[PDB]
Amino acid sequence: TDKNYYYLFDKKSFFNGKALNNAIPGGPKFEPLYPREEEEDYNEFNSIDRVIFRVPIRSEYKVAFPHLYNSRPRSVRIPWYNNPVSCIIQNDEEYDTPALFFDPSL
Amino acid sequence: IESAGFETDLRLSTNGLGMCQLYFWHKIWRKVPGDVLDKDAFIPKLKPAPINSLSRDFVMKTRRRKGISTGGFMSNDGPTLEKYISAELY
Amino acid sequence: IKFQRENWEMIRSHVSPIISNLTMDNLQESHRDLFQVNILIGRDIICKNVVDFTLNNGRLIPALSALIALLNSDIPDIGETLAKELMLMFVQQFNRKDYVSCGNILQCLSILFLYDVIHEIVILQILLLLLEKNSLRLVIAVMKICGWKLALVSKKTHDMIWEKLRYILQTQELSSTLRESLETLFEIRQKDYKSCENFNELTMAFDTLRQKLVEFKKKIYLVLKSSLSGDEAAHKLLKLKIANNLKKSVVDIIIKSSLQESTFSKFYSILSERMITFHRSWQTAYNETFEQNYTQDIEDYETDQLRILGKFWGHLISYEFLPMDCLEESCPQGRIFIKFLFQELVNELGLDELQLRLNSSKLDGMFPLEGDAEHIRYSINFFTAIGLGLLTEDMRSRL
Amino acid sequence: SYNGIGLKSAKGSSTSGHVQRSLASNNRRRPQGSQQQRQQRQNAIKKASIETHM
Amino acid sequence: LFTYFREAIVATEPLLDILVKGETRIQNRVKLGLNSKMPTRFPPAVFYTPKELGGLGMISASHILIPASDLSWSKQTDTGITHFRAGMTHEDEKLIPTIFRYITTWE
């Protein structure tokens, strides 16, 4: 019932992954849209001389902010970015009860 | 720096029950740990560096990006007369 | 009658002693001791001892509860009596503003409930009583103690209690401390408690009661041989995640495999390095293996194999291992192995540097510094046999 | 591909394209705490080394 | 291939890949003969079993867990052996030994 559960299991996310040839490890994988033209030629951009590696930049993050973390994204759809779902259902046959959470101060 | 794919990561961890938001209105700067002006510094190129040499490495990277340091390996220091006061009197 | 009285007195004393003793280090022993002594004729005494103990260590209340339960399982009447006593104590505490006593008693009750000694009804009643006088400090700890259990048994009751607490928090001008307590309780709830005439006969009964109360190796080999680089092999080994028992065995197997190959391969060394980096237990295992080798398994090998082994060890020790080494009588195969190791070290390091490194570690076996009446001469000779320095210097030093 | 490391595509390959992350990787990462020894040694070796305005 | 460059194979990943592919192709040739290539119907038994137990007696170099790496950072800059790739087949935890481990490296 929580919609936010499907984070990086959206259709959109899947599409993005497909585009970027980037498996969300749980999800599916495809033939890449574009052939990986490895022709950087040791340029002054994106070099390991230049950049810093505090974050590992996981491919989880690629399909979440496609246009940012991934460089030269193509045919990439935009994903969702959601609210949290506090929804409590009683399984013991009781009626309107603050069970799982805590009372106000005053 | 450390907040790259923070929120997403959190979401992944928490099965989308916790939603992070990061912000910068306190304008709260802080010393990068470690100590700049160290030529020994760190071990790894590919991995994240250690914390004593963290400051240095970042600075170096920035320099490289700018085009201040010329080459694969370099340093940072004061340009003055008398060999920088004899390396600050040794 | 006099005899009986004496016995009772003795029993009481014993109980007291046990109570005094009771701790985590010697609990079983205490229990055993307790079992030895009678507690049917001296049931009251036992009860007194238990209660007193509870009043005193409160930290060892759980243990006490357990003991009571055990007793009850055999002699239920005694347990009942104890429970009654506890209840009385609680009542007294309530009456007299003896807060500490109440806390202790409450805790005991909770423990009992947990161990299926007393019913949760009593606990519920106590909670209710606490609520009626706005006493948050008393019921908060008790609830925590017997929370999960309460939930399991009387869920409705628990719910009611929670509701009451909530009401107190919100629909009553509570203190700061009280509020804090309430909050704590709530938090706990969220996680569900994360933290005589027939004397002889009786005696007879009690005594009766007392009386009553290769394949693996093969697999490893395959792994070693079904792997391109050593790294891969190491990874494979780690996948297996064999127990800290078998690590040594694995290491031994690896060594054997290495020996089997015609000459020393970097592969095995690499694998070892990988293992070593991975965990302290593997390092320990390696150390053990090394110890076994020079001590008891070295003299068994033929020469080439021995040489290979030495080389491997040198490689391990040039970087990864700590130079820790335990070395007239001990000189055939072993000496040659040592020589080989030294050679390997030299190759890896560089002579002077190697020497320096050796010096840096304690190293009494390889190079004993003290002259010891021309015992170092042998060592010097050995060193000379395989091109090396510093020996001469050492000799000069001693004269 | 996961973190830039998986094999681009399952086809062609002539293989599962399965990817166990190595436990040598961890080892490689770690010895700045445990290489560390070498560093320490190095350090040891090189360890010893206005009024008017006011 | 292996006797000529014993030591020098391990480092080159392309060569390893080719070997994996080549071996698979060879296997499929045999399976082509039997007009199937159903992966269950040819357990490694039938290929690697020697001729003296009725097998083909191939000499695999395919069951190696190949070094994968950040192809981003592989061709570029520097490298280390992290993340192994699959190697060649589904196995029944049957570690087929590899010819390289029975060849003494050139050094």
Coordinates of all heavy atoms in Angstrom, one line a residue, chain C residues 232 235-236 239, chain D residues 5 17-23 25, chain E residues 65-66 68 82-87 91:
Chain C
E232 N 42.1 -15.1 -7.2 CA 40.8 -15.8 -7.5 C 40.6 -17.0 -6.5 O 39.6 -17.2 -6.0 CB 40.8 -16.5 -8.9 CG 40.6 -15.5 -10.1 CD 41.9 -14.7 -10.5 OE1 42.2 -13.7 -9.8 OE2 42.5 -15.1 -11.5
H235 N 39.8 -15.8 -3.1 CA 38.4 -15.4 -3.1 C 37.5 -16.6 -3.0 O 36.5 -16.6 -2.1 CB 38.0 -14.6 -4.4 CG 36.5 -14.5 -4.6 ND1 35.8 -13.8 -3.7 CD2 35.7 -15.0 -5.5 CE1 34.5 -13.8 -4.1 NE2 34.4 -14.5 -5.2
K236 N 37.8 -17.6 -3.7 CA 37.0 -18.9 -3.7 C 37.0 -19.5 -2.3 O 36.0 -19.9 -1.8 CB 37.5 -19.9 -4.7 CG 37.1 -19.6 -6.2 CD 37.5 -20.8 -7.1 CE 37.2 -20.5 -8.5 NZ 37.2 -21.7 -9.3
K239 N 34.9 -17.6 0.0 CA 33.5 -17.9 -0.3 C 33.0 -19.0 0.6 O 31.9 -18.9 1.2 CB 33.3 -18.2 -1.7 CG 32.0 -17.5 -2.4 CD 32.3 -16.1 -2.8 CE 31.9 -15.0 -1.8 NZ 30.5 -14.7 -1.9
Chain D
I5 N 31.0 -2.0 -13.2 CA 31.9 -3.1 -13.1 C 31.4 -4.4 -13.8 O 32.2 -5.1 -14.3 CB 32.3 -3.4 -11.6 CG1 33.6 -4.2 -11.6 CG2 31.1 -4.1 -10.9 CD1 34.6 -3.7 -10.7
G17 N 27.7 -14.1 -17.1 CA 27.8 -12.7 -16.8 C 27.6 -12.4 -15.3 O 27.5 -11.2 -15.0
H18 N 27.5 -13.4 -14.5 CA 27.5 -13.4 -13.0 C 28.8 -12.6 -12.5 O 29.8 -12.7 -13.1 CB 27.5 -14.8 -12.5 CG 27.4 -14.8 -11.0 ND1 26.5 -14.1 -10.3 CD2 28.1 -15.6 -10.1 CE1 26.7 -14.4 -9.0 NE2 27.7 -15.2 -8.9
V19 N 28.6 -11.9 -11.4 CA 29.7 -11.1 -10.8 C 29.7 -11.2 -9.3 O 28.9 -10.5 -8.6 CB 29.5 -9.6 -11.3 CG1 30.4 -8.7 -10.5 CG2 29.7 -9.5 -12.8
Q20 N 30.5 -12.1 -8.8 CA 30.8 -12.1 -7.4 C 31.8 -10.9 -7.2 O 32.8 -10.9 -7.9 CB 31.5 -13.4 -7.0 CG 30.7 -14.7 -7.1 CD 31.6 -15.9 -7.0 OE1 32.3 -16.1 -6.1 NE2 31.5 -16.8 -8.0
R21 N 31.5 -10.1 -6.2 CA 32.5 -9.1 -5.8 C 33.6 -9.9 -5.0 O 33.3 -10.7 -4.2 CB 32.0 -7.9 -5.0 CG 31.7 -8.1 -3.5 CD 31.4 -6.8 -2.8 NE 32.6 -5.9 -2.8 CZ 33.6 -6.0 -1.9 NH1 33.6 -7.0 -0.9 NH2 34.6 -5.2 -1.9
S22 N 34.9 -9.5 -5.3 CA 36.0 -10.3 -4.7 C 36.2 -9.8 -3.2 O 35.9 -8.8 -2.8 CB 37.3 -10.1 -5.5 OG 38.3 -10.9 -5.1
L23 N 36.9 -10.7 -2.5 CA 37.2 -10.5 -1.1 C 38.7 -10.3 -1.0 O 39.2 -10.1 0.2 CB 36.8 -11.8 -0.3 CG 35.3 -12.1 -0.5 CD1 34.9 -13.4 0.3 CD2 34.4 -11.0 -0.2
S25 N 39.4 -7.7 -2.9 CA 39.1 -6.2 -3.0 C 39.2 -5.6 -1.7 O 39.8 -4.5 -1.5 CB 37.7 -6.0 -3.6 OG 37.4 -6.9 -4.7
Chain E
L65 N 37.2 -17.8 -12.8 CA 36.5 -16.5 -12.5 C 37.3 -15.3 -13.0 O 38.3 -14.9 -12.4 CB 36.3 -16.4 -11.0 CG 35.5 -17.4 -10.3 CD1 35.3 -17.0 -8.9 CD2 34.1 -17.6 -11.0
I66 N 36.9 -14.8 -14.2 CA 37.7 -13.8 -14.9 C 37.8 -12.5 -14.0 O 36.8 -12.2 -13.4 CB 37.1 -13.4 -16.2 CG1 37.1 -14.6 -17.2 CG2 37.9 -12.2 -16.9 CD1 36.1 -14.5 -18.3
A68 N 37.0 -9.1 -13.6 CA 36.2 -7.9 -14.0 C 36.9 -6.7 -13.4 O 37.7 -6.8 -12.5 CB 34.8 -7.9 -13.7
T82 N 39.5 -6.4 -8.6 CA 38.2 -6.5 -7.8 C 37.1 -6.9 -8.6 O 37.2 -6.7 -9.8 CB 37.9 -5.1 -7.1 OG1 36.6 -5.2 -6.5 CG2 37.9 -4.0 -8.2
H83 N 36.0 -7.4 -8.0 CA 34.9 -8.0 -8.7 C 35.3 -9.0 -9.8 O 35.7 -8.7 -10.9 CB 34.1 -6.9 -9.4 CG 33.5 -5.9 -8.4 ND1 34.2 -4.9 -7.8 CD2 32.2 -5.8 -7.9 CE1 33.5 -4.2 -7.0 NE2 32.2 -4.7 -7.1
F84 N 35.2 -10.3 -9.5 CA 35.3 -11.3 -10.5 C 34.0 -11.4 -11.3 O 32.9 -11.2 -10.8 CB 35.7 -12.6 -9.8 CG 37.0 -12.6 -9.3 CD1 37.3 -13.0 -8.0 CD2 38.1 -12.3 -10.1 CE1 38.6 -13.0 -7.4 CE2 39.4 -12.3 -9.6 CZ 39.6 -12.6 -8.2
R85 N 34.2 -11.7 -12.6 CA 33.1 -12.0 -13.5 C 32.9 -13.5 -13.5 O 33.6 -14.2 -12.9 CB 33.5 -11.5 -14.9 CG 32.4 -10.9 -15.7 CD 32.5 -11.4 -17.1 NE 33.6 -10.8 -17.8 CZ 34.0 -11.2 -19.0 NH1 33.5 -12.2 -19.7 NH2 35.0 -10.5 -19.6
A86 N 31.9 -13.9 -14.2 CA 31.4 -15.3 -14.1 C 32.3 -16.4 -14.4 O 32.3 -17.4 -13.7 CB 30.1 -15.4 -15.0
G87 N 33.2 -16.2 -15.4 CA 33.8 -17.3 -16.0 C 32.8 -18.0 -17.0 O 31.9 -17.3 -17.4
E91 N 27.8 -24.5 -13.0 CA 28.5 -25.6 -12.5 C 27.7 -26.2 -11.4 O 26.8 -25.6 -10.9 CB 29.9 -25.2 -12.0 CG 30.9 -24.7 -13.1 CD 32.0 -23.8 -12.5 OE1 31.6 -22.7 -12.0 OE2 33.2 -24.2 -12.6

